[PDB]
Amino acid sequence: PLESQYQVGPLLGSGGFGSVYSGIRVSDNLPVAIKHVEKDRISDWGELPNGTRVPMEVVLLKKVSSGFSGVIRLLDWFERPDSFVLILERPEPVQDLFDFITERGALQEELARSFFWQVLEAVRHCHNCGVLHRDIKDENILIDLNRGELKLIDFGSGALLKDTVYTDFDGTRVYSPPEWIRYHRYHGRSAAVWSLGILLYDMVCGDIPFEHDEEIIGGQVFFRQRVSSECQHLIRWCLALRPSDRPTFEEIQNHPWMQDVLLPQETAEIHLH
Ligand SMILES: CN(C)C[C@@H]1CCn2cc(c3ccccc32)C2=C(C(=O)NC2=O)c2cn(c3ccccc23)CCO1
């Protein structure tokens, strides 16, 4: 049972993703996060190979949780009469990227480069596992402050990756692409790249570029902070109005701005320790 197997600590947060508590695995004192969601609040369902009816979140997490990666891994899950409970990794010490940027302001480009590179590798991992996250944003990125490693959280808005059109979106609006605003249609990979452009801007400017729909569809990116010409170019490319004009993951990682990335360890030593 969950209750004897885990020592439950304080609430870490709650919202659309349910309620998440800090925890410790009793057997070996592993730090964990314990996520509860009411069955009545679960819109998207899937099934395991053996036909157990589970939240799609569990299917997606299982797909991305094999091997080591920049994704918070699903360690176990439990079904209760009225809810599911998910046991996730918890780094320590940790801070989400939203809080990090709020506290420290716009990031030095060396740090933004290391962070952005890691998110790109994590997103490539998800896509290789057949999973689209669909809510990439600063709030869903955890920084392991000692190891300098970034981890993606919250697959609650995600989907199985497909090559055909998506007509549903329950992710974060201001990180949502103009084709969604205009047509309620997007393709996974090019929508992902849009969200990555928003994230990169957020990192080097300290806030997101667009508030209103009209800015999102407008085709203009204004820089409020000093940002290098190469970084501006990459951001503007990721934020191309036409989805087909956006870079692939390969083209992003080959962009001149992305060269000579720091290792996670170096990043921690220079910027986080
Ligand atoms: C807005 N929301 C996403 C923020 C998040 C919200 C609470 N939350 C923590 C959380 C997740 C995962 C998926 C959805 C929501 C989560 C997890 C962790 C974690 O280490 N493993 C997790 O699974 C944490 C996220 N955070 C942690 C802070 C301190 C300890 C642990 C934290 C970030 C703050 O809470």
Tell me how the structure was determined: X-ray
Q: For the purposes of burial, counting CB atoms within 10 Å of the CB of 211, is it exposed (0-12), middle (13-18) or buried (19 or more)?
A: exposed
Residue nearest to atom 20 of ligand 1 (CA): 90
**Residue 155 CA, closest ligand 1 atom number:** 13
Regarding the domain delimited by 93-273, which CATH topology (the fold level of the hierarchy) does it fall under?
Transferase(Phosphotransferase); domain 1 (1.10.510)
- Ligand 1: residues with CB < 6 A are 12-13, 17, 20, 33, 35, 72, 88-91, 94, 96, 139-140, 142, 153-154
Strand partners for 36: 19, 85
**Resolution of this entry, Å:** 1.9
Q: Which alpha helices (H) appear in the chain, and where do they start and end?
A: 2-5, 56-64, 97-104, 109-128, 178-183, 188-205, 213-216, 229-238, 249-253, 264-267
Binding site as annotated, residues? 12-20, 35, 89, 96
Q: Which amino acid is at 72?
A: I
CATH 3.30.200.20 maps onto the chain at 1-92
- CB proximity list for 112: less than 8 A, separation 6 or greater: 200, 203, 204, 231
CATH match for 1-92 among 3.30.930.10, 3.30.2310.20, 3.30.420.40, 3.30.200.20 = 3.30.200.20
Contact by Cβ (8 Å): 141, 85: no
CATH 1.10.510.10 maps onto the chain at 93-273
Contact by Cβ (8 Å): 2, 25: no
Contact by Cβ (8 Å): 112, 227: no
Q: Which amino acid is at 263?
A: L
Separation CA 217–CA 177 (nearest Å):
8
Instruction: Please choose, from the candidates 88, 68, 76, 53, the residue with its C-alpha nearest in 3D space to the C-alpha of residue 2.
Output: 76
Ligand 1 centroid – CA 145 distance (Å): 14
Q: Find the farthest-apart pair of alpha carbons in the chain and give their distance in angstroms, rounded.
A: 56
Residue nearest to atom 24 of ligand 1 (CA): 90
Separation CA 237–CA 250 (nearest Å):
13
Separation CA 79–CA 39 (nearest Å):
9
**Quick count: other Cβ atoms within 10 Å of Cβ 224?**
11
Ligand 1 centroid – CA 2 distance (Å): 19
3-state SS, 77-146, equals EEECCCEEEEEEECCCCEEEHHHHHHHHCCCCHHHHHHHHHHHHHHHHHHHHCCEECCCCCHHHEEEECC
